[PDB]
Amino acid sequence: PVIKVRENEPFDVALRRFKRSCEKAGVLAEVRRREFYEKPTTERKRAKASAVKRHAKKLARENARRTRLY
Template identity: 65%
Template sequence: MPSVQVRENEPFEIALRRFKRGCEKAGILTETRRREFYEKPTAMRKRKIAAATKRCKRKVSMDTLRKKPPYKKF
C-alpha cells in the first residue's frame, strides 16, 4: 500500500495526487476491480490465454511493420 508524507507547506491536493499516482503504479485499483467478483479458475486461465494470444499477435504485427524494406530511389 503506497503511503505519502505530506511535506511542510504542501497543499493537500498535491499530496493526494502523489498518493493516487502511487496507487496507479502499484496497480491497486485494477486489482480491486479484478477481485470484486469471484472468477472461476477456468475463466481466469481462458482470460490469460486470450491476453497472451493478443500480445503475441500485436508483437508479430509490429515486427512485420518494422521490417519493411526502405523505398529505393530511381
C-alpha cells in the first residue's frame, strides 16, 4: 500500500494523499479481520456520515457572526 498510482515528481517519501482514489479501502484494509456479507453497505460507505462534522462547523461560523464572538 505504497499504492500503484504514481506520485507527481518521484521522491523517497510517497505522497499518499495524491495517490489513493479508491485503493486499499474495504479491499485490503480489513486485513486479518472477520468478513461480513452485508455489513460493508453501512459499515464502510461513510462519506455522508463524515461530511456532517464539516457542516456542523460551517453552520457555527454563521452563528459566531450573529453572537459577536467574530
